[PDB]
Design a protein around this ligand. Structure first.
Ligand code: DGD
Ligand code: DGD
Ligand code: LMG
Ligand code: LMG
Ligand code: SQD
Lengths: 85, 185, 202, 93, 274, 36, 38, 40, 64, 29, 139, 68, 85
C-alpha cells in the first residue's frame, strides 16, 4: 500500500529510516515468514513491473554490510552514499 | 608527405561476413556438422570451430549487414517464413534435396574444370607452336574455387592462344562487396 | 545406448581406469564424448577416452595452479603470463622433457607402463604421461625399494633430458614438481620408511 | 558448525540429472576449498575456468574497444565529402 | 660414441649436439602476451589511429573552410590519406623487409592482364559512358525519325545523368565515386522500370497485345549495367540507411544510445530499468 | 619534418566529440536554460 | 508526508555532486540517461 | 463449409497434443510432486 | 622557492621520459609492424611465467 | 512484367500481418 | 522493453524468473579470446536455438572467476550467464548460495530451502539457473 | 468437395509436420504466458488467504491430479 | 596448430593410391607422382580428391610445385594448421 500511494503521488522521495529492521537477513531475530514476506514485497515493488516513475527510495542505514544480498544485486539499491565527518 | 613506398591502399570495413571455417569454397556441400579436418588437428586447439560461430554470428557482425532497408524489411518475411513459418521436417527434406543437387552440380563443375584444363593445353599449343603443351594446375584450382573473374578467364585464354605462357596468371578477383543503395537496399 | 566406435578394447581401457567407481566411469564416458566433439567425431574411441582421462588430470592441476594468480602452467590464454602460440623453444623443451620421461619409464623394468604421452595437454606448459598401475600386483598398500628408486629415476628423467638437450642454462621450471616428487620419495625412504643405511629404522 | 549440509547438497546436485530442460551454473571464486565429492562425476564436474580480466592492455583496451564499437556504426565515409569541397574559388557549394 | 663417462656435474653437463637453437625475442611485451593478441592489438591500434586521423582531417577541413584555423595549418595535409604513424610503421616494415580505356594497353605481347589493374576508376566507367552516348544518339535519332518527343526527353536527359555519373566514377575511391555509381544504378534501374512497366510511347501500336511494354535491348542493356554495378562495386555510403529501431538498441550496452533511440521513436518516458 | 604534431596537439586542445555528445550537450543546455 | 536550506549544508563537499545526480534525476530525466544513468 | 468441422477437429487434436502427446519436457512427475508437497 | 619545484618537476619528467624511451626501444627497436607501447606492473602470474620459463636475457629486459 | 512480382512481397506481408493480428486478437481477448 | 522480472510459475521464496535480459555476447569481448568458453557456450546457444535444450538432460556446470575484483564491480560469471540468457532470449533464475548457509538447533533449514528451490525450478523449463558462491555451502 | 477437403487436410498435415516446439527459437516478443506478455498482477483488492487454497485446488486439477 | 603430420601423410597416401590404382605400399612419402604415372590432369584430379577428402582449400599458388607425396602432405598439413584461425 505504501508503494501504491507512492505510485499515485509519483514524483517522490520516500525516505525509509532504520533500514536494518527490514534490509537485514536471518540472524538474531526470528526470521520466519514475516521478514521473508516483507523483503519479498520490497524486492518486487523496487524491481519493476509496477513502473515506479519518479520514485526514489532513500534508505538510511548504519551497517551496509548487514544489508542482505537481495537488496544489493544490480537493480535494487546499487547506489550508496557515505556521509563523512 | 609520409608516402610509404607502396601507394596507401585504404582498408575499408568488411561488408560481408567472412566465410565459415567449415566451408569448402568449391560449390560442393559442406559437411553436416564437423568439417572433417579437425581429426587431423590436435584437441584443445580445435577451439576455433565454435570461435567461428562466435564472431561469424554474434560478436563480429559487419555493420553493413545490420543495415535496415526496405529490401531487408521484405527479406525478413522470407527468412521468418523459412525459419518459424515452415516446419523443420519439410526444411530437412528440402535440405537433403539441395545437398544432393549441389553434389551433382559440383561434379559437373569439376568435369568442366578438367575440360577447361584440356582447352588450356590446346590454346597453349596454338600460340607457342608445339613447345608449351602443359596447363596451370594453380589456375585449375583457381577455376574450381571460383576465384577468377570472367574478364580474367578471357584474358588468360587469349594470352595462351597468342603467346603461350601457361604460368603467367591473371590477378585473383577480389570478393564482391555488399551493394548498398541508401534506404532501398 | 549411446554412439561409440565398436573397435574398443574396453578391458585395456578399464585397466587404465584402476581405482574407479561406476558413476566415475559414467562421467568419464560423458567427457569422452566431449573430447570426441573436440577432435571432431560423433563416436567415442579409446583415444577419446584416454584424452578424457588426461583432460581430467590437467583440469585437476589447473584448479590448483590458478586459484588467485596462477602463472605459466596454463599457457595459451591470451592474457599476461600465458602466450597463445606456445613458443618453439618452450614446446621443444616440453617435448624433450616428456620424451625423456617416457623413454626412462620404458627402459625401467617392472614399472608402470605408458598408455599415452602428450605434449602440452589443455595448452598446459608441461607434458603428461598417462601411467597405468597394476592393482592386482601390489594392491593399494605395497611399495618396494625397486619401485621407489625407479620412480625417482623417472621423475628426474625429464629435467635431466632437458638439461642434456637444451643445455644447463636453458632448463625451465617445469621440472620443479617432478624434482620435488623425487626428493619426496627419497625423504620418505630415509626419514619415514627407515631405508637409510646410517639413519636406520627410526 | 554442523557441516552435514554437504551430504545433502550432494543429493540435491545429483538429482538434477534425473530432471530435464534447464541448465544449472554454479559459480565460485575458490575451487580448492570445494568438496572433492562435489567434484565427482554426476555432480559439478564440468568446469569452465574464467581467468582474470584486469589485464592492463589486452583485456582492457580490446574489451572496452569492442564494447564501444559494437554499440554504433561509427562510420563517417560520407562526411569525407568536404575534403572534395576545398578548392572551389567561391564562397560556398 | 661413449660421449657419456665424461659428464661432469662440476665443469658443466653438455650433450653431443652443440646447443639447440637461438632465441627470438621480438620485444618483451610480445614475449609476455604472445601472438594472435599482439597482432589483434596492433590491428586495433592501426584502425583506431586511422579513424582518428580521418576524423581529425574532416574536422580540420570543416574548421579551415570556416576560417577558424591557425596560421601554421597547411590544407595540403588534408591530402594525406593514411595516418602519419601508420605511414611511418609501413615505411619501417618495408625498410626492414626489402581496348585502350582506363589506363594503357598492350594487346598480347606484355602485361596481358592490364584491364584488371587498379587504374583508379570504377570498372563500369567506360560502360556507363558508352551507354550514355548510345542512349543520347538513339533518342535523338528516334525523335528525328518519328516525331515523338519521349525518345529525346528520356534519351539525352538520361544520357547527361549517366555522363555525370561516369565523370564522378573516374575516381572510385571517394564520396563522388560512390555517389556516381549510385546515380548510374538509379538511372539504369529507372530505365528498366519504365521499359518493363510503362513502355515506350513511340512503340505504341494498334493492338493491346502489340503494345506489350516488354523488355527490349535498351532495358536489357540497362539491367546488365545494373548487375555490373552490383557485381563490381556499390559498397560505400552504407551509413545512409533507415534510422535504427528500439529493437536494435534493446541489447545495446549504451544507455545513452538506447535512450536516444527511445526518445526519437516517441517512447522516451518508458522506464529503462538497466 | 613532422609538422603534424601541431595538428595532433591542436586537436587535443580543441577536439570534436561527435553527434551523440552534441545531442547530450543540447539537452544539458536546455536544462540549464529551463533551470537557471 | 512531512508537512535550513541546501546551501546551509556544509559538512560535505564531494558527495554533493552524487546527491545532485538525484536532484537532476527527479527534476529532469532523459538528461540522466544521457549521462548513462538508466 | 468445411472450415468449422476441420477447425473443431484440429482444436481437439491440439488440445490432446499438449496434454498427453508433447507435454512439459518430461517434468510432469516433478510438477505433480510439487503439488503433492505444497498442499500443506 | 621555485628552484625546488624545478628540481622536482625535472626529476619527474625525466623519470617518465626515460621509462617510455626504454619501453619503446625494447618493445619496438629490437607482423611486428604497428608500434606497441607495452605496459609495466607485472603481476604474480607474469612473474611466475618469466621466472619458471624464458631466460636470463628475457628477465633482464623486464628489469631494464 | 511485375505480375507475380508486385504481389509476392505484398502477400508475404499480408500473411505475416494477419498471423500477428490473430495472435494479438487473442491477446486483447 | 521486453526485459521483465516476473515471479515463479507457481507464484502465489519467490524464485524471481528473469525474462530476456538486455545483454549480448558483445557485452563480453573477453569471450572470443577464451578457448575454454567457446565449445560449452556455443553448444548451449545452438541447443537453445534449435529447441533441443527444451528436451535435453539437465546438467550442472561449474564456473570459476578468481577473487580479484574490487568489491562487487560487475561479476563476470553473472555477466556471462546473463549475456548467454539475453542472447538466447531465455529465462534466467539467479540465486545466491549464501542465503542457504543456515544451521539452527542441529538442523539445516537452508538445505530444505535449496531443495524446494531446485524442485521449483524443475517446473519453469527451459531456464538457466545461476547459483552463485557455491563455496559458501559446498565447503 | 474432395478438393476443398484436400486443402483442409493439407493445412492439417502441415500443422502435423510442425508437430511440437522443436526447431523454433524462443521469442522475446512472444513469451509462452499471456500474463508475461501483458502486465497483469494481482493487487490489494481481490486477493484473500482462502484464495491460496482455491489456487491450490485449481492447480491440482489443471496439472491433472485428484488430491484437492 | 599442431597438425598430426603422420595421420595427414597416411590419408594423403591412401587418397593418391585410391585414385590411381596402386596399393598403400607403392605410395611412399618420397615417391613422385610422376613415378606413379599420374598424368598432368590426373595430378590435378588427385589434388581435387585431396581437397574433397580434407574439406580444405588447397593453396593454389604452389600447386604447380607439388612434386612428392611428402610435399603434398606438407602443404595439406600446413593448410589444416592455417584453417583454424
Ligand atoms: C528420404 C526422404 C525422401 C525425400 C528426401 C529427398 C527427395 C526430395 C527432396 C526435396 C524435393 C526436391 C528438392 C530440390 C531443390 C530444393 C528446393 C529448394 O527450394 O531449396 C530448399 C532450401 C535448402 O535448404 C537450406 O538451404 C539453405 C540456403 O541455401 C540455398 O538456398 C536456396 C535453395 O533453394 C537458394 O538456392 C540459395 O541460393 C542457396 O544458398 C542452406 O544453405 C542449407 O542448404 C539448408 O538450410 O531450403 C529453403 O530455404 C526453403 C525451405 C522450404 C522449402 C520446401 C521445398 C520442398 C519440400 C518438400 C516437402 C514434402 C514432404 C514429403 C517428402 C518428399 C520430398 C519431396
Ligand atoms: C548480356 C546483355 C548485354 C546487353 C545487350 C544489349 C546492348 C545493345 C545496345 C542497346 C540498344 O540496342 O539500344 C539502341 C539505342 C536506344 O536508344 C534509346 O532508345 C530508347 C527506346 O528504345 C526502344 O526503341 C528502339 C527503337 O526505337 C529499340 O527498339 C529499343 O530496343 C527499344 O528499347 C529510349 O527511349 C531513347 O530513344 C534512347 O535513349 O539506339 C541506338 O540506335 C544506339 C546506337 C547509336 C550509335 C552511337
Ligand atoms: C553498350 C553499353 C553497355 C550495355 C550493356 C553491356 C553490359 C556491361 C556489363 C559488363 C562489364 C564487365 C566489367 O566491368 O568488367 C570489369 C570487371 C572488373 O573486375 C573486377 O572488379 C572488381 C571491382 O574492383 C574487383 O577488382 C575484382 O577483383 C575484379 O575482378 O571484371 C569482371 O569481369 C568481373 C565481373 C563482372 C560483373 C558482372 C558483369 C555484368 C553483366 C552480366 C550480368 C547479366 C545480368 C542480366 C540481367
Ligand atoms: C560499347 C563500348 C564498350 C566500352 C567499354 C570497354 C572498352 C574500354 C574500357 C577498358 O579498357 O576496360 C577496362 C575495364 C576494367 O577497369 C578497371 O578494372 C579494374 C578491376 O579492378 C579496377 O577497378 C580499375 O579501377 C578499373 O579501371 O574493363 C571492362 O570493363 C571491359 C573489358 C573487357 C570486357 C568485355 C569486352 C568488351 C570489348 C569491347 C572493347 C574492348
Ligand atoms: C533491385 C533490388 C535488389 C536488392 C538488393 C540485391 C542484393 C543485396 C544483397 O546483399 O543481398 C543479400 C540478401 C539478404 O539481405 C540481407 O539480409 C541480412 C540478414 S540474412 O542474410 O537473411 O540472415 C541483413 O542483415 C542485411 O541487411 C540484408 O541486406 O541475400 C540474398 O539471399 C539475396 C536474395 C535476393 C536478391
Amino acid at each position: 500500500e505504501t508503494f501504491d500511494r507512492l505510485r499515485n503521488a509519483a514524483p517522490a522521495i520516500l525516505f525509509i529510516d532504520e533500514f536494518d529492521a527490514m534490509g537485514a537477513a536471518r540472524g538474531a531475530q526470528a526470521s520466519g515468514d514475516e521478514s521473508a514476506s516483507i523483503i519479498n514485497e520490497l524486492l518486487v515493488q523496487m524491481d519493476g513491473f509496477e513502473d515506479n516513475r519518479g520514485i526514489v527510495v532513500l534508505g538510511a542505514t548504519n551497517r551496509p554490510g548487514a544489508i542482505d544480498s537481495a537488496l544489493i544485486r544490480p537493480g535494487r539499491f546499487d547506489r550508496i552514499i557515505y556521509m563523512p565527518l | 608527405f609520409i608516402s610509404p613506398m607502396t601507394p596507401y591502399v585504404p582498408e575499408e570495413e568488411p561488408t560481408r561476413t567472412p566465410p565459415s571455417i567449415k566451408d569448402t569454397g568449391t560449390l560442393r556441400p559442406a559437411s553436416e556438422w564437423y568439417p572433417q579436418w579437425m581429426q587431423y588437428r590436435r584437441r584443445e586447439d580445435n577451439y576455433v570451430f565454435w570461435q567461428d560461430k562466435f564472431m561469424r554470428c554474434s560478436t563480429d557482425i559487419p555493420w553493413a549487414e545490420k543495415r535496415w532497408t526496405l529490401f531487408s524489411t521484405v527479406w525478413y518475411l522470407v527468412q521468418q517464413l523459412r525459419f518459424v513459418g515452415t516446419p523443420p521436417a519439410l526444411r530437412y527434406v528440402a535440405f537433403l534435396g539441395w545437398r544432393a543437387l549441389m553434389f551433382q552440380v559440383y561434379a559437373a563443375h569439376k568435369a568442366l574444370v578438367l575440360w577447361q584444363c584440356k582447352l588450356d593445353a590446346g590454346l597453349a599449343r596454338i600460340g607457342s607452336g608445339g613447345a608449351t603443351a602443359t596447363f596451370s594446375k594453380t589456375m585449375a584450382l583457381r577455376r574450381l574455387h571460383w576465384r577468377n573473374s570472367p574478364l580474367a578467364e578471357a584474358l588468360y585464354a587469349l594470352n595462351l592462344y597468342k603467346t603461350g605462357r601457361v604460368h603467367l596468371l591473371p590477378p585473383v578477383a577480389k570478393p564482391i562487396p555488399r551493394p548498398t543503395f541508401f534506404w532501398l537496399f | 545406448n549411446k554412439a561409440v566406435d565398436p573397435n574398443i578394447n574396453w578391458y585395456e581401457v578399464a585397466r587404465a581406469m584402476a581405482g574407479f567407481t561406476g558413476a566415475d566411469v559414467m562421467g568419464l564416458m560423458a567427457r569422452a564424448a566431449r573430447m570426441a566433439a573436440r577432435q571432431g567425431r560423433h563416436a567415442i574411441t579409446e583415444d577419446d577416452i584416454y584424452a578424457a582421462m588426461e583432460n581430467k588430470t590437467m583440469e585437476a592441476t589447473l584448479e590448483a595452479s590458478t586459484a588467485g594468480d596462477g602463472g605459466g602452467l596454463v599457457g595459451g590464454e591470451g592474457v599476461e603470463g600465458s602466450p597463445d602460440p606456445i613458443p618453439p623453444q618452450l614446446r621443444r623443451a616440453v617435448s624433450v622433457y616428456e620424451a625423456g620421461k617416457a623413454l626412462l619409464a620404458y627402459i625401467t623394468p617392472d614399472y608402470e607402463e605408458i598408455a599415452r604421452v602428450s605434449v602440452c595437454p589443455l595448452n598446459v606448459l608441461t607434458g603428461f604421461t598417462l601411467f597405468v598401475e597394476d592393482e592386482d600386483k601390489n594392491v593399494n598398500a605395497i611399495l618396494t625399494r625397486s619401485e621407489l628408486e625407479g620412480r625417482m629415476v623417472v621423475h628426474l628423467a625429464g629435467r635431466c633430458a632437458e638439461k642434456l638437450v637444451m643445455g644447463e642454462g636453458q632448463m625451465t621450471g617445469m621440472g620443479s614438481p617432478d624434482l620435488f616428487h623425487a626428493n619426496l620419495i627419497a625423504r620418505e625412504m630415509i626419514m619415514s620408511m627407515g631405508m637409510g643405511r646410517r639413519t636406520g629404522p627410526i | 558448525a554442523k557441516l552435514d549440509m554437504i551430504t545433502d547438497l550432494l543429493v540435491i546436485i545429483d538429482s538434477v540429472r534425473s530432471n530435464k530442460g534447464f541448465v544449472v551454473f554454479a559459480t565460485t571464486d575458490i575451487p580448492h576449498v570445494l568438496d572433492p565429492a562435489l567434484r565427482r562425476p554426476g555432480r559439478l564436474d564440468e568446469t569452465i575456468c574464467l581467468p582474470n580480466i584486469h589485464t592492463s592492455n589486452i583485456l582492457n583496451f580490446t574489451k572496452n574497444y569492442e564494447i564501444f564499437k559494437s554499440a554504433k556504426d561509427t562510420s563517417n565515409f560520407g562526411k569525407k565529402i568536404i575534403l572534395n569541397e576545398m578548392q572551389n574559388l567561391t564562397t560556398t557549394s | 660414441s661413449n660421449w657419456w663417462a665424461s659428464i661432469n656435474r662440476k665443469t658443466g653437463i653438455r650433450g653431443p649436439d652443440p646447443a639447440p637453437a637461438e632465441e627470438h625475442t621480438n620485444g618483451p611485451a610480445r614475449d609476455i602476451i604472445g601472438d594472435r593478441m599482439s597482432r589483434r592489438l596492433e590491428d586495433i591500434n592501426k584502425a583506431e589511429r586511422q579513424r582518428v586521423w580521418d576524423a581529425m582531417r574532416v574536422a580540420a577541413a570543416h574548421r579551415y573552410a570556416a576560417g577558424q584555423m591557425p596560421a601554421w595549418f597547411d590544407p595540403e595535409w588534408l591530402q594525406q590519406e593514411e595516418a602519419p604513424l601508420n605511414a611511418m610503421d609501413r615505411m619501417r616494415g618495408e625498410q626492414r623487409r626489402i581496348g585502350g580505356g582506363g589506363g594503357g594497353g598492350w594487346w598480347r605481347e606484355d602485361d596481358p592482364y592490364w584491364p584488371l589493374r587498379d587504374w583508379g576508376d570504377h570498372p563500369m566507367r567506360w560502360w556507363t559512358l558508352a551507354f550514355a552516348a548510345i542512349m543520347a544518339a538513339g533518342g535523338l535519332a528516334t525523335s528525328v525519325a518519328t516525331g515523338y518527343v519521349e525518345p529525346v526527353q528520356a534519351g539525352l536527359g538520361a544520357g547527361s545523368l549517366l555522363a555525370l555519373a561516369g565523370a564522378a566514377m573516374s575516381d572510385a575511391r571517394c564520396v563522388p565515386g560512390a555517389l556516381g555509381v549510385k546515380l548510374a544504378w538509379a538511372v539504369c534501374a529507372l530505365i528498366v522500370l519504365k521499359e518493363v512497366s510503362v513502355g515506350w510511347q513511340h512503340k505504341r501500336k494498334r493492338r493491346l497485345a502489340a503494345s506489350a511494354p516488354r523488355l527490349e535491348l535498351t532495358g536489357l542493356a540497362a539491367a546488365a549495367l545494373c548487375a555490373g554495378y552490383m557485381l563490381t562495386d556499390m559498397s560505400g555510403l552504407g551509413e545512409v540507411a533507415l534510422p535504427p529501431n528500439p529493437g536494435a538498441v534493446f541489447k545495446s550496452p549504451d544507455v545513452a544510445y538506447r535512450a536516444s533511440v527511445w526518445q526519437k521513436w516517441g517512447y522516451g518516458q518508458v522506464q529503462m530499468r538497466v | 619534418d613532422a609538422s603534424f604534431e601541431k595538428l595532433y596537439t591542436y586537436f587535443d586542445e580543441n577536439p570534436s566529440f561527435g553527434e551523440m555528445a552534441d545531442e547530450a550537450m543540447e539537452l544539458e543546455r536546455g536544462a540549464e536554460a529551463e533551470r537557471a | 508526508t512531512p508537512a535550513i536550506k541546501w546551501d546551509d549544508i556544509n559538512g560535505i563537499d564531494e558527495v554533493k555532486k552524487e546527491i545532485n545526480e538525484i536532484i537532476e534525476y527527479l527534476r529532469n530525466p532523459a538528461l540522466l540517461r544521457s549521462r548513462g544513468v538508466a | 463449409r468445411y472450415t468449422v468441422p476441420f477447425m473443431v477437429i484440429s482444436g481437439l487434436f491440439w488440445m490432446i497434443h499438449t496434454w498427453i502427446l508433447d507435454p512439459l519436457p518430461n517434468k510432469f512427475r516433478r510438477q505433480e510432486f510439487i503439488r503433492y508437497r505444497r498442499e500443506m | 622557492k621555485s628552484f625546488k619545484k624545478k628540481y622536482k618537476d625535472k626529476a619527474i619528467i625525466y623519470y617518465e621520459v626515460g621509462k617510455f624511451v626504454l619501453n619503446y626501444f625494447l618493445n619496438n627497436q629490437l607482423t611486428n609492424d604497428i608500434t606497441i607501447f607495452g605496459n609495466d606492473f607485472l603481476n604474480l602470474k607474469t612473474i611466475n611465467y618469466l621466472s619458471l620459463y624464458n631466460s636470463k636475457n628475457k628477465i633482464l629486459l623486464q628489469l631494464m | 512484367n511485375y505480375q507475380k512480382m508486385v504481389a509476392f512481397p505484398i502477400l508475404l506481408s499480408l500473411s505475416h500481418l494477419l498471423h500477428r493480428r490473430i495472435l494479438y486478437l487473442f491477446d486483447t481477448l | 522493453n521486453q526485459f521483465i522480472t516476473y515471479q515463479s510459475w507457481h507464484s502465489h521464496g519467490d524464485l524471481f524468473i528473469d525474462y530476456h535480459p538486455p545483454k549480448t555476447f558483445s557485452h563480453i569481448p573477453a569471450l572470443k579470446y577464451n578457448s575454454i568458453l567457446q565449445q560449452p557456450i556455443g553448444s548451449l546457444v545452438c541447443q537453445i536455438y534449435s529447441g533441443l535444450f527444451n528436451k535435453q538432460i539437465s546438467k550442472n556446470i561449474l564456473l570459476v572467476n578468481p577473487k580479484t575484483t574490487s568489491n562487487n564491480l560487475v561479476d563476470y560469471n553473472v555477466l556471462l550467464i546473463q549475456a548467454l540468457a539475453g542472447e538466447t532470449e531465455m529465462k534466467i533464475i539467479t540465486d545466491n548460495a549464501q542465503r542457504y548457509a543456515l544451521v539452527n538447533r542441529g538442523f539445516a533449514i537452508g538445505i530444505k530451502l535449496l531443495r524446494e528451490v531446485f524442485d521449483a525450478i524443475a517446473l519453469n523449463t527451459p531456464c538457466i539457473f545461476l547459483l552463485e558462491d557455491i563455496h559458501a555451502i559446498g565447503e | 468437395a474432395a478438393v476443398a477437403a484436400g486443402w483442409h487436410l493439407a493445412s492439417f498435415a502441415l500443422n502435423l509436420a510442425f508437430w511440437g516446439v522443436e526447431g523454433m527459437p524462443p521469442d522475446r516478443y512472444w513469451p509462452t504466458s499471456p500474463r508475461i506478455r501483458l502486465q497483469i498482477r494481482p493487487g490489494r483488492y481481490g486477493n484473500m488467504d482462502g484464495g491460496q487454497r482455491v489456487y491450490m485446488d485449481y492447480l491440482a486439477r489443471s496439472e491433472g491430479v485428484p488430491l484437492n | 596448430a599442431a597438425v598430426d603430420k603422420a595421420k595427414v601423410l597416411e590419408d594423403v597416401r591412401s587418397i593418391i593410391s585410391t585414385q590411381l590404382g596402386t596399393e598403400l605400399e607403392k605410395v611412399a612419402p618420397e615417391a613422385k607422382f610422376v613415378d606413379l604415372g599420374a598424368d598432368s590432369l590426373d595430378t590435378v584430379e588427385i589434388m581435387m580428391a585431396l581437397e574433397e577428402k580434407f574439406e580444405i582449400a588447397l593453396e593454389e599458388e604452389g600447386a604447380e610445385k607439388i612434386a612428392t607425396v611428402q610435399d603434398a602432405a606438407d602443404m595439406i598439413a600446413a593448410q589444416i594448421a592455417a584453417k583454424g584461425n
